Design a protein around this nucleic acid. Structure first.
Ligand SMILES: Nc1ncnc2c1ncn2[C@@H]1O[C@H](COP(=O)(O)OP(=O)(O)OP(=O)(O)O)[C@@H](O)[C@H]1O
Ligand SMILES: [Mg+2]
Ligand SMILES: [Mg+2]
Length: 341
DNA sequence: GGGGGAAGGACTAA
DNA sequence: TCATAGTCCTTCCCCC
């Protein structure tokens, strides 16, 4: 299997550039303004001009302004980025029916039946970068290898505006050298549990007692890491099916007053159903972001489709169940639907 | 012993 | 006042 992975570069920021060419060269910061106070919120992303100085996805807009008070700050326009994204995905289908859209800016193409070696793949990668730059003036990084995971690692190494192949020999090389924390699926919490076992390279997972690793990081991740170690991982590229759709919204001020949170809850439902678009969910969950940031969630599954009417009354029950089972004030409130028919 | 689903918190990522 | 969507893992639970 020859997988080709595509990841758009500093996407939201780059799209803002394409719609306003005069931003080219200046640090650009796309923000999610929460609204409780001027400059409240986080950075969704930044171009490399801004990123070069420490301004990057996740930090408070406040900080970014202290680092680069003169960078361009723009409100995130997801709808716009999503349409640009869809158009790019379509260009990708012209290269393989077997395509997996991982996120708004990531996709895997199984090009096994399109090329015969990593040389042709590489050229096809170039064709793709030029096609996109051409049609949408968007630069992307291409990663090529024998499976989804390494194709993604290839990309991580070559970004931005790059392209890299990781042949079988380099795979085995990485299995021993590559820092295990840089493996897709391994987060901080998991990276830590691993270090606490001397495990710092994939190979180290082959020498350790399984049940020992399993009891530490869970059975699924254990099998995942090992299979990668044995150079055996090869999950198929498959059309993705969003299993759930929801929306969570931050409130002006925290509280635990049902009637004061209702507005937000309902606003979150209207926005969600909209997104549902044709989909009828059989399950629903009300999600809460406590003052301390912990997450409290209570949901329920029904034996049939959920009407917006139901969603309404039902969400209030779940909301209160949360209210009674947690004495914390709520910072953000949202809803989430799943188990579509 | 395990198929299978429902619920709640974990974990990645974003 | 710093703090922005989704997928699974783990557990209990009915039950063949
Ligand atoms: N912390 C974040 N919060 C919300 N959205 C984020 C965050 N980080 C990234 N994104 C969104 O996801 C998109 C895709 O993510 P990705 O990490 O690939 O993008 P990027 O910011 O361009 O960086 P890279 O060039 O390394 O891919 C971004 O354009 C945005
Ligand atoms: Mg990405
Ligand atoms: Mg990207």
């Amino acid at each position: 299997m020859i997988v080709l992975f595509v990841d758009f570069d500093y996407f939201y920021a780059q799209v803002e550039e394409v719609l306003n060419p005069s931003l080219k060269g200046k640090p650009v910061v796309v923000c999610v303004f929460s609204g409780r106070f001027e400059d409240s919120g986080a950075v969704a992303t930044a171009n490399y001009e801004a990123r070069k100085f420490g301004v990057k996805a996740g930090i408070p807009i406040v900080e970014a302004k202290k680092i680069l008070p003169n960078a361009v700050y723009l409100p995130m326009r997801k709808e716009v980025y999503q349409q640009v994204s869809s158009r790019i995905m379509n260009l990708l289908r012209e290269y393989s029916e077997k395509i997996e859209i991982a996120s708004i800016d990531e996709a895997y193409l199984d090009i096994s039946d399109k090329v015969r070696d990593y040389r042709e793949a590489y050229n096809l990668g170039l064709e793709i970068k030029n096609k996109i730059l051409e049609k949408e003036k968007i630069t992307v990084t291409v990663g090529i290898s024998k499976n989804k995971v390494f194709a993604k690692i290839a990309a991580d190494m070559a970004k931005p505006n790059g392209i890299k192949v990781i042949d079988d020999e380099e795979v085995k090389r990485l299995i021993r050298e590559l820092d295990i924390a840089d493996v897709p699926g391994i987060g901080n919490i998991t990276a830590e549990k691993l270090k606490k076992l001397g495990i710092n390279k994939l190979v180290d997972t082959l020498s350790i007692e399984f049940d020992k690793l399993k009891g530490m990081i869970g059975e699924a991740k254990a099998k995942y890491l090992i299979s990668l170690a044995r150079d055996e991982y090869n999950e198929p590229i498959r059309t993705r099916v969003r299993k759930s759709i929801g929306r969570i919204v931050t409130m002006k001020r925290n509280s635990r007053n049902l009637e004061e949170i209702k507005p937000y809850l309902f606003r979150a439902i209207e926005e969600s159903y909209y997104k549902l678009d044709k989909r009828i969910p059989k399950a629903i969950h009300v999600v809460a972001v406590t003052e301390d940031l912990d997450i409290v969630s209570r949901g329920r599954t029904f034996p049939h489709g959920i009407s917006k009417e139901t969603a309404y009354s039902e969400s209030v029950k779940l909301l209160q169940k949360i209210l009674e089972e947690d004495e914390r004030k709520i910072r953000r409130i949202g809803v989430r639907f799943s188990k579509f028919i």
